[PDB]
Amino acid sequence: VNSFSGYLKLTDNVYIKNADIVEEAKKVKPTVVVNAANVYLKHGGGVAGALNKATNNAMQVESDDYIATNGPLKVGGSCVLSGHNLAKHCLHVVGPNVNKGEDIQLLKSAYENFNQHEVLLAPLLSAGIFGADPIHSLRVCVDTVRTNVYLAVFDKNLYDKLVSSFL
Numbered sequence: 001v002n003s004f005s006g007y008l009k010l011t012d013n014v015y016i017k018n019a020d021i022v023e024e025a026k027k028v029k030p031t032v033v034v035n036a037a038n039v040y041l042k043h044g045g046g047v048a049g050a051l052n053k054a055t056n057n058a059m060q061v062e063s064d065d066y067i068a069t070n071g072p073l074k075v076g077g078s079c080v081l082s083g084h085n086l087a088k089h090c091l092h093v094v095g096p097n098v099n100k101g102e103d104i105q106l107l108k109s110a111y112e113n114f115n116q117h118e119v120l121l122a123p124l125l126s127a128g129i130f131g132a133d134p135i136h137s138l139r140v141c142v143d144t145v146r147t148n149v150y151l152a153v154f155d156k157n158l159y160d161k162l163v164s165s166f167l
């Protein structure tokens with residue numbers, strides 16, 4: 001038993017809810033919240049901008065030190081940093097950004113990072129401003145992640161479409 005509430009169960013291990021991941025994180029304090037990161041950990045907009053804003057920019061400060069030491073992430077890759085006031089840890093995962101021309105097949109590699117964590121609160125990778133089809137992203141999530149994932153979908157309309165079209 002864990003503390004996530006109000007989720008619809010899609011599979012043995014995947015759950016979904018219409019929610020703002022920022023508010024969901026501050027209430028639950030999950031062990032891991034996933035950020036929809038880019039390779040530079042520049043948290044300007046989308047999920048990343050919202051999570052970073054909720055940390056009062058501490059996520060960005062930590063991220064800039066990470067990049068200065070380690071260089072950029074790979075598309076499809078990840079790093080574990082602090083969750084600040086939102087979670088114990090933040091798993092920064094880089095899904096392909098269709099609006100940059102990145103290969104969509106890298107979406108499966110991105111979701112594989114979730115398997116290193118027993119339970120996660122996460123957004124749909126490559127959705128929103130990353131330009132992928134959220135229904136495809138949900139399919140890849142279900143077919144790739146084997147650990148317990150709680151997906152937060154900010155937009156109520158998209159949420160309804162994701163549930164109603166789920167196979």
Ligand SMILES: Nc1ncnc(N2CCC[C@H](CCC(=O)O)C2)c1Cl
Nearest residue numbers: 127128131132133134153154155158
């Ligand atoms: N076909 C699409 N491709 C990509 N993103 C899409 N949506 C647009 C509305 C907001 C939504 C925000 C992300 C979320 O809901 O967590 C993203 C669509 Cl509809």
